[PDB]
């Protein structure tokens, strides 16, 4: 005998967590983790409200009607879990926690002696531009900024779910060439 | 008399739509709309599963226990709706459908005679780099690409929820300066 109140409680909590994740501003680094963390809790809630509801359908005998729908739900949950495992594999591979935080498709990366830079990126392009500067010294790509702790390696690489695209450093645009004070531009070209 | 089956049906459908939105790849433009559209449906479902559950609590008289929780849910839904209205105001202001599609914090924009460019961006930076090139002619910022239909204006602006930051075109890095063939780099500096 599974009481129906737990389903309502799970529904209310899941609504709370959807409402929280749908309004969190993605400005600072701490929010992103929060923005991820809430989702994680939500996912558990999304599981808890699902199987319990399924446990009701078998309890009421109304499970033969929508077994396909719940099978689809479980299949998509398995796909999402595999996606999370791939993200964990990427962040282990990129030596940083950025892949779990940011939701970008790709991650341009380069490893130094002490620090490893893993900056999110939309898609593989012919060229990649990195802007080094301060107000704090940092490297910025497409708005995403990472506090620099060392120089830039002439081989930068873009990680992906299934792509590993190396890039070649061609030119470094110093302030004299560009005319913009306190801003260094590094340009990388996609190696064939 | 509100039957309890509708709550289970809404739960199942909401689980389906969470599962769909949590796996959609954000590579092409059509997916983004889909990725948004599903969310829209989900939001309706998130409403439908909520108030109905609330309608059960008043039906069972167990509403006095968690009125605060549902009030918080409704308050957060109001905040999310206001956020969507601000996004619609932005896309009306930016003359493009990109703000409703992309989830970036800011949008760098510039208006031409025939076409209007509204490219997503993370945060306001000192400089902004735009890469013009083909394989198709387009302007690319931080991986996000938009098919170019005209030139670039020397005044580019960044839209935001509450910020309107103008930028000044300082230098144009042509292929001779950079050494990268078929790639033009436009550099904008933030006006004070």
């Amino acid at each position: 005998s599974l009481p129906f109140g737990w389903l309502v409680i799970g529904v209310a909590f899941l609504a709370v967590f959807q409402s929280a994740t749908k309004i969190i501003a993605l400005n600072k680094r701490w929010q992103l983790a929060l923005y991820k963390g809430f989702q994680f809790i939500c996912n558990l809630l999304l599981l808890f409200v699902t199987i319990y509801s399924h446990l009701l359908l078998v309890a009421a005998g109304m499970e033969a009607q929508f077994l396909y729908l719940y099978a689809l739900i479980y299949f998509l949950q398995c796909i999402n879990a595999c996606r999370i495992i791939m993200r964990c594999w990427l962040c282990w591979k990129c030596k940083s926690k950025n892949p779990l935080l940011y939701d970008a498709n790709y991650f341009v990366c380069w490893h130094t002696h002490n620090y490893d830079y893993c900056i999110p990126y939309n898609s593989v392009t012919d060229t990649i531009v990195v802007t080094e500067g301060d107000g704090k010294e940092d490297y910025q790509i497409g708005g995403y900024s990472e506090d620099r702790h060392s120089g830039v390696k002439d081989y930068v690489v873009v990680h992906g779910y299934f792509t590993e695209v190396y890039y070649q450093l061609e030119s470094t645009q110093i302030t004299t060439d560009t005319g913009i004070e306190n801003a260094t531009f590094f340009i990388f070209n996609k190696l064939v | 008399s509100l039957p309890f089956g509708w709550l289970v049906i809404g739960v199942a459908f909401l689980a389906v739509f969470q599962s769909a939105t949590k796996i959609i790849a954000l590579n092409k433009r059509w997916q983004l709309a889909l990725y948004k559209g599903f969310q829209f449906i989900c939001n309706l479902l998130l409403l439908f599963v909520t108030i109905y559950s609330h309608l059960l609590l008043v039906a069972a008289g167990m509403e006095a226990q968690f009125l605060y929780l549902y009030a918080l849910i409704y308050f957060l839904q109001c905040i999310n709706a206001c956020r969507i209205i601000m996004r619609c105001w932005l896309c009306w202001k930016c003359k493009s459908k990109n703000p409703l599609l992309y989830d970036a914090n800011y949008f760098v924009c510039w208006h031409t005679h025939n076409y209007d460019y509204c490219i997503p961006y993370n945060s306001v930076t000192d400089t902004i780099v735009v890469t013009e090139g083909d394989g198709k002619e387009d302007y690319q910022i931080g991986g996000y690409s938009e098919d170019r239909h005209s030139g670039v204006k020397d005044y580019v602006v960044v839209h935001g929820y509450f910020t309107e930051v103008y930028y000044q075109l300082e230098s144009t890095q042509i292929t001779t300066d950079t050494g990268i063939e078929n790639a033009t780099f436009f550099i904008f500096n933030k006006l004070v």
Binding site: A25, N27, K28, W30 | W89, F162
Partner: peptide
């Protein structure tokens, strides 16, 4: 329509800074 935007501009940032102050010692 811009009056609401001007009023609502910095209140969200102030709330986020309050959250910063509250949960800084928690994480």
């Amino acid at each position: 329509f811009s009056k609401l935007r001007e009023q609502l501009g910095p209140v969200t940032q102030e709330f986020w800074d309050n959250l910063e102050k509250e949960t800084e010692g928690l994480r």
